[PDB]
Amino acid sequence: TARLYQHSSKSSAEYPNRPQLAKYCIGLAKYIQSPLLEYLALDESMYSLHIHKHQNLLPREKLIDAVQTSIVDIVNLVGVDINEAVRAPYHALALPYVCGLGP
Amino acid sequence: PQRLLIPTVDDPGIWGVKVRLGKEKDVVRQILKKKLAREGTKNPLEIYSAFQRDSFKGHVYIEARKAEAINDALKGNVNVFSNNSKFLVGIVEYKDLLRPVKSSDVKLTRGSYVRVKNGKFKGDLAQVDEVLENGLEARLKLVPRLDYGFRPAQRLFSEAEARVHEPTIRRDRDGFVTYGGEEYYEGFLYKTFRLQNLIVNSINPTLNELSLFQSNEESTTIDLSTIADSLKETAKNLVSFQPGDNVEIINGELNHLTGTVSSVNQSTIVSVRLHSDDDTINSETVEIPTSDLRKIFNVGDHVRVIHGKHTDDTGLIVEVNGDKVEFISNQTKRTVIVFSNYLIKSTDSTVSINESGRFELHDLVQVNSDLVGIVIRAQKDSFDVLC
Amino acid sequence: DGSPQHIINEVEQLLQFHVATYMDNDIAGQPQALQKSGRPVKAIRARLKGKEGRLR
Amino acid sequence: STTITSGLKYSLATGNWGEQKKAMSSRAGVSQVLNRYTYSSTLSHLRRT
Amino acid sequence: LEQMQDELIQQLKLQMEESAIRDANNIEQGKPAIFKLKLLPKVKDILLRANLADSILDNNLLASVRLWLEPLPDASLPAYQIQKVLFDAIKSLPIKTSHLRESGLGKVMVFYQKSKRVEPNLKRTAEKLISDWTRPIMG
Amino acid sequence: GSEKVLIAQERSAANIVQVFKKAAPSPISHVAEIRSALEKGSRLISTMQ
Amino acid sequence: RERACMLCGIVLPGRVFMQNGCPNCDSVLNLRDSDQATVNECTSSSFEGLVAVGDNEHSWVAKWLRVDRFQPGLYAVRVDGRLPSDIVAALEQYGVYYRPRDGSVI
Amino acid sequence: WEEPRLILDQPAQHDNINKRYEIRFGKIYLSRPTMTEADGTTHAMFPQEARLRNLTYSSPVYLDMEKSMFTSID
Amino acid sequence: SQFPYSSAPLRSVKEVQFGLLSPEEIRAISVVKIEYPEIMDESRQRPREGGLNDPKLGSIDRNFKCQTCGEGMAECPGHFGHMELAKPVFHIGFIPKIKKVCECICMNCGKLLLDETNPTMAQAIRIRDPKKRFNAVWQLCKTKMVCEADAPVSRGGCG
Amino acid sequence: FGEMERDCMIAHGAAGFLKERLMEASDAFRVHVCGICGLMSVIANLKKNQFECRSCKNKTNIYQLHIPYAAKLLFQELMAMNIAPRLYTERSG
Amino acid sequence: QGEQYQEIIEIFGDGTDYQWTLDAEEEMEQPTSLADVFEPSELKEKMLTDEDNVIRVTDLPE
Ligand SMILES: [Zn+2]
Numbered sequence A: 001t002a003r004l005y006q007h008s009s010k011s012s013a014e015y016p017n018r019p020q021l022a023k024y025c026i027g028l029a030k031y032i033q034s035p036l037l038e039y040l041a042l043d044e045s046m047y048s049l050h051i052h053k054h055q056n057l058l059p060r061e062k063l064i065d066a067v068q069t070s071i072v073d074i075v076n077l078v079g080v081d082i083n084e085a086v087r088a089p090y091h092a093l094a095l096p097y098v099c100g101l102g103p
Numbered sequence B: 001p002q003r004l005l006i007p008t009v010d011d012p013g014i015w016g017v018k019v020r021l022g023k024e025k026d027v028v029r030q031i032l033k034k035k036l037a038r039e040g041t042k043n044p045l046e047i048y049s050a051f052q053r054d055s056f057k058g059h060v061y062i063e064a065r066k067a068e069a070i071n072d073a074l075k076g077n078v079n080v081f082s083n084n085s086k087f088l089v090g091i092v093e094y095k096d097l098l099r100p101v102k103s104s105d106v107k108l109t110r111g112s113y114v115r116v117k118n119g120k121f122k123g124d125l126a127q128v129d130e131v132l133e134n135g136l137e138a139r140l141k142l143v144p145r146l147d148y149g150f151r152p153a154q155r156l157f158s159e160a161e162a163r164v165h166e167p168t169i170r171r172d173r174d175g176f177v178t179y180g181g182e183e184y185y186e187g188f189l190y191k192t193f194r195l196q197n198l199i200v201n202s203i204n205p206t207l208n209e210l211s212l213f214q215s216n217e218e219s220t221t222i223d224l225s226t227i228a229d230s231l232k233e234t235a236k237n238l239v240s241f242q243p244g245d246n247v248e249i250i251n252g253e254l255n256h257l258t259g260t261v262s263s264v265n266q267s268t269i270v271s272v273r274l275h276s277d278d279d280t281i282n283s284e285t286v287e288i289p290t291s292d293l294r295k296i297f298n299v300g301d302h303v304r305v306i307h308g309k310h311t312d313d314t315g316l317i318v319e320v321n322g323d324k325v326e327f328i329s330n331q332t333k334r335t336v337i338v339f340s341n342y343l344i345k346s347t348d349s350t351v352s353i354n355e356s357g358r359f360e361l362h363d364l365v366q367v368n369s370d371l372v373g374i375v376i377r378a379q380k381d382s383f384d385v386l387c
Numbered sequence C: 001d002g003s004p005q006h007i008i009n010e011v012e013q014l015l016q017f018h019v020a021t022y023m024d025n026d027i028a029g030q031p032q033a034l035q036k037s038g039r040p041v042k043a044i045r046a047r048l049k050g051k052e053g054r055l056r
Numbered sequence D: 001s002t003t004i005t006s007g008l009k010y011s012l013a014t015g016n017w018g019e020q021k022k023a024m025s026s027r028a029g030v031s032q033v034l035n036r037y038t039y040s041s042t043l044s045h046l047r048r049t
Numbered sequence E: 001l002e003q004m005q006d007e008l009i010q011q012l013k014l015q016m017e018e019s020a021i022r023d024a025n026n027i028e029q030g031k032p033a034i035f036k037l038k039l040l041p042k043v044k045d046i047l048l049r050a051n052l053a054d055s056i057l058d059n060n061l062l063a064s065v066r067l068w069l070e071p072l073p074d075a076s077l078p079a080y081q082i083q084k085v086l087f088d089a090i091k092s093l094p095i096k097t098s099h100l101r102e103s104g105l106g107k108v109m110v111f112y113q114k115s116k117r118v119e120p121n122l123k124r125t126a127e128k129l130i131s132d133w134t135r136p137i138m139g
Numbered sequence F: 001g002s003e004k005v006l007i008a009q010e011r012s013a014a015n016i017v018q019v020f021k022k023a024a025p026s027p028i029s030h031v032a033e034i035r036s037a038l039e040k041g042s043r044l045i046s047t048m049q
Numbered sequence G: 001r002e003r004a005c006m007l008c009g010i011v012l013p014g015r016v017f018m019q020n021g022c023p024n025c026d027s028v029l030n031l032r033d034s035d036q037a038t039v040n041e042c043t044s045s046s047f048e049g050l051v052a053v054g055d056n057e058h059s060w061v062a063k064w065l066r067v068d069r070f071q072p073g074l075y076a077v078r079v080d081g082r083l084p085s086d087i088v089a090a091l092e093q094y095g096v097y098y099r100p101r102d103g104s105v106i
Numbered sequence H: 001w002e003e004p005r006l007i008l009d010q011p012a013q014h015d016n017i018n019k020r021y022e023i024r025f026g027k028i029y030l031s032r033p034t035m036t037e038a039d040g041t042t043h044a045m046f047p048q049e050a051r052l053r054n055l056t057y058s059s060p061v062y063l064d065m066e067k068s069m070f071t072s073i074d
Numbered sequence I: 001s002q003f004p005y006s007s008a009p010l011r012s013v014k015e016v017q018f019g020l021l022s023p024e025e026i027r028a029i030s031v032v033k034i035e036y037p038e039i040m041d042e043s044r045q046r047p048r049e050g051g052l053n054d055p056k057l058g059s060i061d062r063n064f065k066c067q068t069c070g071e072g073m074a075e076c077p078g079h080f081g082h083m084e085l086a087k088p089v090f091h092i093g094f095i096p097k098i099k100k101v102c103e104c105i106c107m108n109c110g111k112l113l114l115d116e117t118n119p120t121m122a123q124a125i126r127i128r129d130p131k132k133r134f135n136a137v138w139q140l141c142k143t144k145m146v147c148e149a150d151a152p153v154s155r156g157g158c159g
Numbered sequence J: 001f002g003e004m005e006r007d008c009m010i011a012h013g014a015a016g017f018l019k020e021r022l023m024e025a026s027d028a029f030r031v032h033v034c035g036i037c038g039l040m041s042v043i044a045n046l047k048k049n050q051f052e053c054r055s056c057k058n059k060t061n062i063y064q065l066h067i068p069y070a071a072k073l074l075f076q077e078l079m080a081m082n083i084a085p086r087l088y089t090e091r092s093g
Numbered sequence K: 001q002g003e004q005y006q007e008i009i010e011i012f013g014d015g016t017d018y019q020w021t022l023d024a025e026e027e028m029e030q031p032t033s034l035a036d037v038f039e040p041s042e043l044k045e046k047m048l049t050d051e052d053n054v055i056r057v058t059d060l061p062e
């Protein structure tokens, strides 16, 4: 997730005065601190990761649905602190995957 | 009255004389001083009035009746050039020399959205909450730019983060917060800015800033009068015509008529050849103002987007829902809905992908951990990779 | 903004002079357009004539 | 003093015997670099018209 | 000579009135005004002829010029070609106070000056013409 | 740091009358010209023909 | 420092307006007997088009600017700012009509 | 001494006082050539040093200017 | 073989046709409109768009590429822009020719002062060479100082 | 290689040597021309392999010429003075 | 003077012959739907369409 984070415009806006390698280090530290939220921050880019060896044989909608159901399962396993999600937009990434909610 | 005061033949003449730049008011004051000093003498300065205008640089206009009076008035002055660069002002120009300027805008209206010329908030849209009576400054509603301890991106004032990074916040009212000497009202900065720091015309609004400003009023973009005016201005200015374009007429006696642009002269007169069932009418060319022309888009024509999020996208028109036009793209190969004001009939794409992305053509790009490929075709926001 | 005909004539003659001396700065019977150093401006016409011109 | 100083220095350095802005349509070559290839050439250059 | 020119100009006046009536009726019937544009070249050629100015002022063709310049009741302005040709003709002819009194073109000129859909160049020319026509009255 | 030498300039003398013959394609057949220079400073003032 | 009197159109230094008042408008404005707020509301330092008049009676410019009945001196074609509503009503009480010189009214 | 007198006049009326301001040029003083360094010191210059350091072998010229303040009331 | 490959066939020039450039052609061949006198954006590289050194006009730098054709400095030929004038002006090289044409035609109704009815005019018409034809027509119509309302039957003249 | 040397090579009749001197040993350049307007206004992206004269609105009638760079400069300077030198690869009659 | 003022009024009119035309012109010069304020492809991304309100109001998991 760090290699995609360092090029994301969100990271560039967050840290305008920092080079790419600093963003790579920040991505690594954020991945260590919370892997789930770092995977969530990729948004559409997380379907291009190496998930399975034969993941290219599936239709795109099938892969997206499988990934989304896995995220819903894992997020509802973990739980979301609603006040933090309301205040910190970084933690609000898991709120659409809460059971009964959506984007 | 005002209309009766227009000049006549028997009114005193007006002469204009070129002077050095920046000394016009100095010449005016010197002429007034000499007129006052020589008043009541044997040879008084036989003039009547003298003035100058800031816009008409390098010109000083004196109202008199004799050229010798002008020579006497200019005698003893150093700002006047060596040659007698004097001319007779036409009588019709007398009213024009004293006509006012900047009338378009009686005054700045409170609540309008304006852009900032310079400063740390250079280019950010700001709402005119208050207009100072002096007219040199005005208090404005802005989006704060702070790092809380080269400028940070604009964002609504976060009181909690400000307190965490700096616990020296002061409070005076409810919803009115003072942080770092700057007054923030419910997340929006209220700071006075000078008149010379603002753009009050040709203002281009964005959905993001509009939503960010109207979010605090608990009703999304509730206000749409100035926004509609900005839409009208952008729609009128963005329309550019070319020969051979099929256009339709909105007003005038020739309303609801189709025609093809034959030639374009300047940017306000367009000669159009109309199409109709009568052959004798089809052989006539009519020059029509651009303000009463609307482009005609037929189904199945290559059109290139002028401006917007889908800029430089080409394709074939599929559905024409009046103002809104739908077309299948060429690059993304998907249907895109863009307004008809943003379309130009370009039969070929010829899109250059230079100065985009991070990838030259035929670059060997690592797709993921264990995948690699070569860029085959490049697009504005996508790439084609051969594994 | 505002149109005193004399000022229009002056500025439009200045524009005509600039466009004319951009192409031909050897116009007989009028002064040449000069650089800030005092040397005359090298027009397009002077690039094409003489021993050192484009052709020869 | 820079007027006289610069005018004299420019005219002697470049050979244009006039005002610097008036270099066009002015006499040139009034001042030249002294020839020092041999003694006789220096004498000849010092006695030239 | 002059009588033949007067007869031809009166015939042109009748043709212009008939064309204006036909175009107004067609506009009321949902059809564009085409007759005025068709008659425009002949009217332009006649107006550009300098020696016919005296006969034009004698026959009061400026009344029909005002009628063409008069906006139709649907609040639709005439074609820009008609306005430009008539303004150029007005500039090319020496219109006096008596001719203005006979024709009443000042009302339409004031309307064109005050209107905003009219081109600003036409606005400036109308202002200049109004100033020139007010010039002899006060001196 | 560059050695510069002034070259003597040759000019016609002032305050002397010189009579010349104008060429054939001209109404003038002879001319008598004098150039006048004040003794103090030796500077040209006026030319009279 | 100079300010342009909104009503009559004359231009004088602001300290002159405070200490002595407007020589022409003193019959209806009482600028000398007025505080700094009223002076600012009737004299503006932001103006354009300096005008010097020698003979008010015969100058067509003075008649066009409606200053032919005033003291000769520095005058402004356009003055930024308008008179307040209370001062306008007070002038209407005196029977004098106020015509703005801001250019926006014509 | 060709043009030894610059003259400025001002018939001030602001009590008529006709004031003439004029300056006269006097003697010319010359010196031997001198060299002024960046640190501010000065010393006599010789041509070999001027050749080596790319200086100009020149000497200052001084002129006596006398100012007088003429005034006549008439 | 010192040039990179191109699929366009290689031919030689057989004819050069001269002429004037029309405003429509100038607008059509242009790639950008020039309206900003300032050469540099903010004196911090990256020249201003719409200025006299717009990057679409071509690249004259080693490391930069043209934003119009995408080619390098060695291959890019350069591209033209246009600049709309507020008022029309004379082309300095054609002013005497404009004067002669003005003499040749009528300033009110844009027609030649003489028609083919005059046999000398017909003879002037017959010569194929445009320069000599113009010279003959000008030598004839220069004398004629009045547009003819009727035929010397109306020829369309305004008189 | 001045003008007199050019005349001497003309007098020798060696056209190939003259062409090689003035092109291969000097500013040899390659341009693209529209087959309709005959102007050097083609926008060629050789690696993208797309040619287009936007004015004439054609993509197929386009040729390449080998001309001196000074000739290209001369034609562009003429175009700057509103003259239109059109290069065609066929005769008309 | 009054007589020439009346003559000027007769020649140039008081404007009432076309004041109603001017009022109609000003009325037609003067005039909100988000479908016309921004592009549908921008409305959809910002969840501003009617279908997003239908999804948000319906009592079912999204
Ligand atoms: Zn006052």
Ligand SMILES: [Zn+2]
Pocket (backbone or CB within 6 Å): I057, I058, I059, I066, I067, I068, I069, I070, I071, I076, I077, I078, I079
């Ligand atoms: Zn290029």
Ligand SMILES: [Zn+2]
Pocket (backbone or CB within 6 Å): I106, I107, I108, I109, I110, I111, I147, I148, I156, I157, I158, I159
């Ligand atoms: Zn004619």
Ligand SMILES: [Zn+2]
Pocket (backbone or CB within 6 Å): J034, J035, J036, J037, J038, J039, J053, J055, J056, J057
């Ligand atoms: Zn072409």
